[PDB]
Every structure is written in C-alpha cells, then in structure tokens.
Amino acid sequence: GPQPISRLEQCGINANDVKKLEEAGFHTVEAVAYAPKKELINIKGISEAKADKILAEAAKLVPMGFTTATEFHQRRSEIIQITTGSKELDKLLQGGIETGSITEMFGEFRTGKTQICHTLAVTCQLPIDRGGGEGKAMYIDTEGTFRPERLLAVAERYGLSGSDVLDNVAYARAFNTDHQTQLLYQASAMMVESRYALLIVDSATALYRTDYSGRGELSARQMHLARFLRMLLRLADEFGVAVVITNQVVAQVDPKKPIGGNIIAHASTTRLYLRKGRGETRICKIYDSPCLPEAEAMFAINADGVGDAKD
Amino acid sequence: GPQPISRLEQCGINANDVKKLEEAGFHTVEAVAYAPKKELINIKGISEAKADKILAEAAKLVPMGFTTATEFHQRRSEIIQITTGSKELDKLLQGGIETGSITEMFGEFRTGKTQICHTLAVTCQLPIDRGGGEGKAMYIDTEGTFRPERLLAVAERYGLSGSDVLDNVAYARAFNTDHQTQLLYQASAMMVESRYALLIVDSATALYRTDYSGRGELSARQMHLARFLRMLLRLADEFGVAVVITNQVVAQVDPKKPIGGNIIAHASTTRLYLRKGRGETRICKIYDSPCLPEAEAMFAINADGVGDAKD
Amino acid sequence: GPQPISRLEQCGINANDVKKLEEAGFHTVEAVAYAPKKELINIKGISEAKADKILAEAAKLVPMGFTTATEFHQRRSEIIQITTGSKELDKLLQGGIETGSITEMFGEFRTGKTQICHTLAVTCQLPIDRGGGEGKAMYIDTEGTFRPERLLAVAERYGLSGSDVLDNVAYARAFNTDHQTQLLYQASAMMVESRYALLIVDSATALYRTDYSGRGELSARQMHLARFLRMLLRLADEFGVAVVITNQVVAQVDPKKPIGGNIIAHASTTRLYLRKGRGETRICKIYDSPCLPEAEAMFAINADGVGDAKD
Amino acid sequence: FVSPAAQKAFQPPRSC
Amino acid sequence: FVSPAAQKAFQPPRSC
Amino acid sequence: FVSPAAQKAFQPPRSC
DNA sequence: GGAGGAGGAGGAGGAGGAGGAGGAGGAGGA
Ligand SMILES: Nc1ncnc2c1ncn2[C@@H]1O[C@H](COP(=O)(O)OP(=O)(O)OP(=O)(O)O)[C@@H](O)[C@H]1O
Ligand SMILES: Nc1ncnc2c1ncn2[C@@H]1O[C@H](COP(=O)(O)OP(=O)(O)OP(=O)(O)O)[C@@H](O)[C@H]1O
Ligand SMILES: Nc1ncnc2c1ncn2[C@@H]1O[C@H](COP(=O)(O)OP(=O)(O)OP(=O)(O)O)[C@@H](O)[C@H]1O
Ligand SMILES: [Ca+2]
Ligand SMILES: [Ca+2]
Ligand SMILES: [Ca+2]
Ligand SMILES: [Ca+2]
Ligand SMILES: [Ca+2]
Ligand SMILES: [Ca+2]
C-alpha cells in the first residue's frame, strides 16, 4: 500500500505543516510527491521554501525516476484484474478490469452499465485466487440507481456473506458536479484507512450535461470534467484501485456517441461500448485500449448480476 | 556522438567548475556551447568571467559558424530515419521519423498515437540497414498507457529478442508538468552514458491542460510548455535523437484542433494528423513539415504494432 | 558595393588602429561613418581624439548630408527587388522583396514562412533581368528547419545548377539569442569579401521567447532584440542586402498577434501576414509598409517552392 | 462525513 | 534515480 | 569560423 | 592662512480552448 503522509514528520517536516497538507487533500507521501510545486504554494500556510523541502523529502520516499521496460513489465505482470463475472467478458479484457487505470463503459440505456458496476462491486472483494482484488468497493452514484439487492444477488452466486459484502461497499450519492468532485477528496482519506480495490463513478458525466447547460459554459464544463478525471487518475496511481466510470450516449446527427468530448476519450485508457443484444444478452466491444484488440464479446444480465450468456 | 563535458578540463576549466556545470544540467561540450551566457551566470559558483572563459573554450570544441548549403546537404544526406513499421507510412515521411528534430503526432482517441510510439520504441533498436537507429529508446509517459507487451509484439515481427528489446527502452512516468521537465534533465545525463536513438513524450501536452486550469494561467502554461519544447530541441541537437511527442485534440466551436496553441505548432517541425479509418486502419496526414508535401497515407494497428493496411 | 575599411589607411589612420576597428566589427568605411562617437570610444585602443579623426575621415568618404527628394527618388528607382517566385505575390509587393530594408513575415504554423525563405534564398541568385539580385544568400536559422532539398526544388524550376545554387547559400544555425547576434558580426565580415543580396533570419524572435522567460526579463528581452534589429538595419544600409526576418504569432486573449512587441513592429518597414488558405494555397496580406496599400494576395506552396496558386 | 461502518477495514467476506 | 539496468549501454537486440 | 566554400565569391548559377 | 558646493534620468508584452442532439407510417386482393 501507499505510505501515510505522517511519514513526512520523520524526515524534517513540521507536524503542523503535515496537518495543512491534510486539509488540502494529501494523505499519502505519494500524493504529495506526485503533486506540483504550484499545488502546494496554493495552500495557505505553505510557503515557497516549505514546498521545496516537502517535495524534496517526498521525492526520496517514492521513486520518480527512470527504470527499464523489463522492470516495468515485471511489475505489471503482478497487477490485479478484477473479474467481470463473465468468462466471455473476462477473455475480452484478457483477465478482467485492470487496476491502476481508468476504465469507461458507455452505451444506451439498459445495456448494463449499472449492472456491471454492481457485479464489480462484489467480485472486487473476492480473493485474488478467485479473480478478485481483496479490497473494498467505493460506489459514487450520481443517478440514484444503486441497488444493494443486486449486490446480494451477486454474492449468493459466489457464495459470500451478503451481510459482509454490504459492509465492504462504501456508498455515496452525488447531487451535482461540485459534490461529485468533493466526494473524491473524502475518498482519498478513506483509502488510506482501509484497503479498497475498486472505485465506481456511475455516471461520471450524467450531471455535467445539466450543471453546464449553456453554449458558453462548454469550456468550463470540459475543464471541470478534466479536473475530475485528473483526480481519478491520482487515486488510481496513489492507491492502485481500479477506477470504473460509466458514460451516457448521444445520437449522431450526420449511431451512438459517448458524451464528454475529447476530454473523456483521451483520459480513459479502456473504453467499453455496450450494445443491446437479444433478451437478456448484451454485447461488449473494446472501443479503445492500449493493449487489447478491437474485439467483441457477449455477456448477459442474469438474476445474479452479470454472467455469461445462458443459452 | 557528443563530447563529454569532462573535455573542458583539458582546456583550462577547473574541474570544480565542470562539476557545477553538471548540477545545472550540462553534461556535454555542445550543451555548454549552445547555452547562453545568461544561463551560466544563473549558476551559483559561476561568475561573469568564468562563463566567458567556459563559453570561449566550448566554442573551440564545437563549430558554431557559417558553412555552405553544400556541406549541410551532404551532412543531412547521412541522417538516420527510423522506420514506422509501415511501408505506406514510411513513404509518406520519405524514409521514416527523422532524427535531430521534433515530430508531433496528434489526433482523436484510439487513432494510434500510443501505438506508433510503441512501434517506434522497438524499430529504433534495429540496425540502420533494416531502417532503425541502432540506439536505445526513451519513453516519457504522462498517461500511464505504456504497455511493454505491445513492444514484445513488435519485436516478434522483426524477430528480435523480446528480453533484449525491453532492456533498451528506458521508461519514466511523469505525474505533472514540473516532473515532466525534470525528467528531461535526467535524460541528458543518460544520453551521454548510452546511445539513444529516439525520445518519446506521450503525451507532451496532456498534463498542461489540468496543471494550469485557470483563465489567467494561460500565459504561464504556454511559457512552461515553451521551455519544455525548447529543452527537447536541445536534446535533439545535442545527441541527435529523434524526438516524437504526441498531442491531444479539441473540438472546433465555429473539426479537430491540436491543443498547445501556437507554441507547439511553431516548435514542431513535422506534425502528423491521425484519423480513424475503417476497422483497424488509420489515416496519417502531413499537417506541417519543412520538406514533405501535404499528403496522406493509410496504415493499420495490427496485433504486432503499426504496420501496413492488411487487406 | 561598400568601401573596405582598409581605405582609411590612405587617409591618415594608423593601420594598427584599422585592425582595432576590425575586432570591433567594422569592416567598411560606411560602418565606421554610421557609427556613433560613443561606439568607437568603447574600443580599447581607440581614444577620444582617434575616434574624432576616424569619424572625420570616414565622413569624407561617404556622404552623410542633405540631398533632394529628386536625387533620392532617382537613386531609389534603381533599387533591386527580389522576386518571390509568385506573380500574384510580386504584384502585391510591387516588384518583390525590396533590398536595403527589413521585411518581416509572420503567421501561424505551416503558413509558409520557411518556404518563402527557401524560395527567396534561390531567386536572389537569379540575374536582375529575371527578377533576382545577383548575390549570395545568407540564412541564419534558429529552428533547425533549413532544408537544402527545398532549394534544389526551386532551382530546377528556374533551371539553375543545383550544385551552384547550394554554393551561394551561406548557412548558420543559431542556438541562442547571444549566438544569433554574434552571427551577425561574422555576417558583416563575409559581406565584404563576397556579394550578398539577401539575409534571412528564421526565426528572428523564436529564441527570445525562451531565453528571457521571466516576467522581469521583459525589458532586457526587448532591449536585446532592439539591438539585433538595429544591427540588421546596419547590414541593410552598409551592403544593401534585403533583410527578411520571420516571426511567430500568439493568440489574442480579448485573432493572431505577432510576437516581439512594439520593438519588432516599429523596426520592420514591411510586415507580411500569412494565413492558411485551402489545400496548398496561402494568403499574404500587407500588414505594414511605407508605400504599399493594405491589400492581399494568394500564393501557394508547391513541390518547387513558393509559386502562384495552381488551379 | 464518514460512516462508522465505512471507516472499518476490509473484512474478507465469509462463505455462505 | 537511474535504474541499474537503464545505465547499461545499448546492446544490439539478437535474433529470435 | 568561415567555411572555405563560403569565403568564395558569388558565382552566377549556370543553366541546367 | 584660509575656505564649500551642486542633481538627475524611463522603460517593456504576451497567451488558447471547448461538443453535442433524434425522429417518422403505410398499404389490398382474388
Ligand atoms: N434482477 C434482474 N434480473 C434480470 N435483469 C435485470 C435485473 N435487474 C435489472 N435487469 C435488467 O438490466 C437492465 C438494466 O441495466 P442497468 O441498470 O445497468 O442500466 P444502465 O445501462 O445503467 O442504464 P441507464 O442509462 O438507464 O442508467 C435492464 O434490461 C433490466 O431489465
Ligand atoms: N494488440 C492490439 N491489436 C490490435 N489493435 C490494438 C491492440 N492494442 C490496441 N489496439 C487498438 O489501438 C487503438 C489504441 O491506440 P492508442 O493506444 O495509440 O491510442 P491513442 O491515440 O494514444 O489514444 P488516447 O488519446 O486515448 O490516449 C485502439 O483502436 C485499440 O483497439
Ligand atoms: N515539398 C513540399 N511540397 C509541398 N508542400 C510542402 C513541401 N514542403 C513543405 N510543404 C508544406 O509547406 C508548409 C510548411 O511551411 P513552412 O515550412 O514555411 O512553415 P512555417 O511557416 O515556417 O512554420 P513554423 O512556424 O512551424 O516553423 C506545410 O503546409 C507543408 O505541408
Ligand atoms: Ca444506470
Ligand atoms: Ca483514451
Ligand atoms: Ca494514449
Ligand atoms: Ca512547426
Ligand atoms: Ca519554420
Ligand atoms: Ca514598421
């Protein structure tokens, strides 16, 4: 896990300053090391010289230099991939939902964006031997469509204590885009105290469509969304969680486009396009990824979460 | 290759001063010769008179005067062009990615900016006879989308030792724009010790969009980016590497514009615009170049990196 | 042509002093006559009385008094205008690039600043009957984007020996702003030995944007640029060459502004604003001139340099 | 605020 | 910092 | 420094 | 032998970024 920011006191930082770094949202040594000098200057008590020392000492506790692709290939071969509860879907992702990265699932209505998030919320608690991440689940919800009964269904499938599964899912409802970003700062505080494997924002863009309604609010909208996505990457690098955001679609005027513009498209490393199949079956397509080929799969929404097409 | 800065000691420079030039980021005689008098005065121990002597002696070891277009045409006819792994793409570039210069590739998501960088990271290690540069690869990554498994795929295509290919790619992840520039100073130290053919920053502008969010931070943003690009030109002139940066796009309000403003546009000598074709095929267009006509090509992203359209 | 500074020895100047004027950058009688008394006092061996004599004798060899607009209109009607390789562009300039003056071309990227400079570098060698200047070309380059292959293309269009054309283009690369000014002093030495028709600085302002990064370095930046432009005027008056500098642009916050401030705007007599047209066509606008009306033209970048719009 | 049950550490879900 | 494997010089990739 | 080919005087480019 | 005093003079710009939004029936025959 990451190093708590208290470890800066054993390096020459006044504990009164570590407390000021705490109110700014920094709870780990990594979060302070990854931060720019500019970000620390914006804090009240921190001066130019303090940030230089705080960054210098943080730099010693976490490596921020060059390595070889060999060492990076070795370290990545040990990365956790949480199972999607579907063999055919896990094979498409070559293991499952990859941690330390932002995965985005978009599609029409009913295509299973909320249903995959409820399956992932449980299967992240499974032992790694069974395809999990052995961590808690954080579910930021912006639509009100979080159903704990859908978690209990997935728990029964994997034979887990439904009461214990509901104890490892931290749930927050976001009511606007300012709140949605505010909830991520509290997320950083919690992820130090307990081990989390997966973070879910559902939907990451739903509230942006109506908080910034105007024509001239477009730049301010994409800028605020860019900061939210930048903060999700922070949590993914800091704690190694798997960030899974969902996205809504739109119609092509000149046939389904995800909303959020180029900001959401450049930021997400894996983009999953979900279509409606027949009955309860759905089709997941690799829409963008650094390592996976543009392919398709066929999963299903069953009475016990997302599984393989039962036919 | 370039001359190590130690050669200044055999010319009248106190080895205690060469050490001070070392902490300022100068490791070659060329880097000191190309530097302004102003840049050396900003160093602590260096005085006005020392910089005059240091510059005078550096001037003798590297030519900084006039020549003829004949001599320059002869010297340029011997310049290395690294293959893009695609015949149709190499023909568009009239040889491949040209060294000693800054090449920029921009486009929408999925259009192959990271995939070309992973192909270039391998094919730069090929012998010049096969279209390579016979040097190591440096991959500064600001998004987290560096996949060594995509390098092993390109290695198999060219029948190279995947273990040896991963040993010639130096990888660093940048977490903010200050770190991104800091990594270039360490790059200058490494490029003296070993032979590098290619430097990759992917993406060179992704972090600038959110480190400088404000409206009044725009000048400070483009100024910090201008210094980063000025330092990339330094490495390209000092070591003769091929600098390949990537860029993200934006929507036209009044249809895809690269971000970074006029700073990135004036600085990059070759600009490559990548579009999405059909299936796995992509379209690369010459967007700006001093010598290449505004034309197009059609490459593809295959299971073994960037290649020609397989159809 | 101008008179070599050796002609001062036949007028009462000790040849040991003419040698001291040589190290200060004076190689012609005109350069010494146009110089202030203050500039000669700053030389080591020269005293107050010597400079008085040196200036008095130089004053006799070159006319520095009043004439009539008639005599000046007659002398100007014999001035050389180098062709831009485009009929529509030459008509906008009423003849071409006018010698003995500073012409500045600015615009966005790709708009043809480097391409016009490569066409001008060849067409300055044409006989005056064909629209040239019958002189060599000097190309100070601060970006690294000098392509001798683009000269050979323009040579074929005018049916000139490509080998001989590359022998008449003196090329120097500037790495910082101090070097850029230093190269102009060597330019003054060369322009006495051989006949030059055109001097090109591309770009004259690119390096100033990053050599003087700070907020408080702004005055020192514009002062150093003012001296460089003052020295370009010196070469234009001394040798009668056509000085063509290029400039980069910037965005308007409150739509494209040339950089360099009021210094570059007051100093350049003709300012050419280049826009991007359609395909390979560009639009050149008279942005400032003492004699030309504010008009526009449409040229094109072709496989043989700058020419007329082929359509 | 932080729920007193959300502050608790991850407990491995038992078998049922 | 510099990785001890990144400090090593360029070795020509063998054939496989 | 001055290139020995740049010190040479302007030669009229021949026809090709 | 002795016995101080007199201010003044401005200047120098630069920097882009940002998508999104469906919809609409019809037409007998051997
Ligand atoms: N217990 C269940 N058993 C079977 N199918 C179910 C069950 N619960 C929901 N579904 C089905 O799953 C789909 C709902 O998917 P989901 O909640 O993920 O939607 P979504 O993609 O988030 O949509 P939206 O954009 O409207 O929020 C519907 O087809 C619904 O009938
Ligand atoms: N092994 C593979 N085989 C085939 N196609 C692949 C493979 N890996 C990735 N791709 C495809 O390559 C594309 C990804 O391109 P790349 O990683 O270069 O994106 P990018 O241009 O950097 O995008 P972004 O702005 O999102 O970072 C996708 O279309 C993906 O499906
Ligand atoms: N041989 C050629 N044939 C046709 N077009 C060409 C050729 N070489 C370059 N071009 C085009 O000319 C343009 C490049 O112009 P140029 O080199 O003058 O740029 P610039 O104005 O100096 O830009 P920057 O500010 O980036 O340096 C591009 O549109 C490029 O495609
Ligand atoms: Ca939903
Ligand atoms: Ca992406
Ligand atoms: Ca990428
Ligand atoms: Ca450019
Ligand atoms: Ca140029
Ligand atoms: Ca003017």
Numbering used by the authors:
A (entry chain D), B (entry chain E), C (entry chain F): 21 to 274, 283 to 339
D (entry chain S), E (entry chain R), F (entry chain Q): 3289 to 3304
Reported in the publication:
We obtained RAD51 NPF structures on both ss- and dsDNA with bound TR2, which showed clear density attributable to the TR2 peptide. TR2 decorates the outside surface of the filament, binding across adjacent RAD51 protomers. BRCA2 residues 3289 to 3304 could be modelled in the map at the TR2-RAD51 interface, with no appreciable difference in binding mode between filaments on ss- and dsDNA. BRCA2 TR2 adopts a bipartite mode of binding to the RAD51 filament. TR2 residues 3296-KAFQPPR-3302 bind in extended conformation to an exposed groove on the surface of RAD51 ATPase domain that includes the acidic-patch helix. The polar side chains of K3296, Q3299 and R3302 project towards the acidic patch, forming a basic stripe that complements the charge of RAD51 D184 and D187. Hydrophobic contacts are provided by residues F3298 and P3301 that become buried at the interface; the aromatic side chain of F3298 packs against the peptide bond linking RAD51 E154 and G155. TR2 amino acids 3289 to 3295 extend beyond the acidic-patch groove and reach the protomer interface, to interact with the adjacent RAD51 molecule in the filament. Residues 3292-PAAQ-3295 fold in a single-turn alpha helix that packs against RAD51’s inter-domain linker sequence, shielding the RAD51 residues that mediate self-association between protomers in the filament. S3291, which is a target of CDK phosphorylation, is in the correct position to hydrogen bond to the glutamate of RAD51 E91.
The BRCA2 tumour suppressor protein preserves genomic integrity via interactions with the DNA-strand exchange RAD51 protein in homology-directed repair. The RAD51-binding TR2 motif at the BRCA2 C-terminus is essential for protection and restart of stalled replication forks. Here we used cryo-electron microscopy and structure-guided mutagenesis to elucidate the mechanism of TR2 binding to nucleoprotein filaments of human RAD51. We find that TR2 binds across the protomer interface in the filament, acting as a brace for adjacent RAD51 molecules.
